[PDB]
Amino acid sequence: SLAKRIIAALEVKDGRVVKGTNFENLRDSGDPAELGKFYSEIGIDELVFHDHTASVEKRKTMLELVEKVAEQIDIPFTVGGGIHDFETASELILRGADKVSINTAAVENPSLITQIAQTFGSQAVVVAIDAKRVDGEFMVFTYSGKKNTGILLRDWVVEVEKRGAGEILLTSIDRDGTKSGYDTEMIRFVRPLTTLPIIASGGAGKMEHFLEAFLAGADAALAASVFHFREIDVRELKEYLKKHGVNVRL
Numbered sequence: 001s002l003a004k005r006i007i008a009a010l011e012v013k014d015g016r017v018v019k020g021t022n023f024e025n026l027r028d029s030g031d032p033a034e035l036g037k038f039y040s041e042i043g044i045d046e047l048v049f050h051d052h053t054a055s056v057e058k059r060k061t062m063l064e065l066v067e068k069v070a071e072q073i074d075i076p077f078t079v080g081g082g083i084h085d086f087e088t089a090s091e092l093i094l095r096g097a098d099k100v101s102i103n104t105a106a107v108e109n110p111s112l113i114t115q116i117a118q119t120f121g122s123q124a125v126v127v128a129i130d131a132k133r134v135d136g137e138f139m140v141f142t143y144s145g146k147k148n149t150g151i152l153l154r155d156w157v158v159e160v161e162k163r164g165a166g167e168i169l170l171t172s173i174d175r176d177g178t179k180s181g182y183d184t185e186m187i188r189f190v191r192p193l194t195t196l197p198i199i200a201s202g203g204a205g206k207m208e209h210f211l212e213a214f215l216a217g218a219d220a221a222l223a224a225s226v227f228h229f230r231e232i233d234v235r236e237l238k239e240y241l242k243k244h245g246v247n248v249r250l
């Protein structure tokens, strides 16, 4: 069966992890680079950083983050949060990120996907798609879930692959922040529409949710607070998944 990845998401601001972690062993539980290194050592496959720094310092702050993280880890990492053009994405990849996440800017200018891919390869471009049910249809939302674009998820997935994206980070707004489970109906809906790797995001609460997401056709599963606050142990999770037939890296 197909190889599956466990991904930790770190929300960051001003070079700090927002709300930190429960990991007492670390010198500084809010240092993104230290936390990243720790996650790679306990068995996380990749990292996603999402930045919320204020506009005047944002560009420099995200570049510093990327350089510091790149020195501490050899596993892939993605950076995102307000990447609106090619030059911003380029500077971040050159400074050390393996991949960039784009969402609002991709919907507003789908050629941005192609532009980044032309220089850095499709594998450098993660399109984050936030979606929610509206009147029985899956719709795409932008601006941190504030705007219903009126674009069907079905149509956007196909366009994203056509434009040259390498991966889709699929967040169910219906589940994000809850610990109720991944939106497996949404994952199953997207799976036949694309050949791209799908990162399931939103709703992780317990180890069984990961199994469910992988059965639904996710290639990777992303989570944040379940790991940060140690509700789920990463090694225990991989051992659980392997036991039940999922091809994870031990």
Ligand SMILES: [Zn+2]
Residues within 6 Å of the ligand: 011, 050, 051, 052, 081
């Ligand atoms: Zn964020």
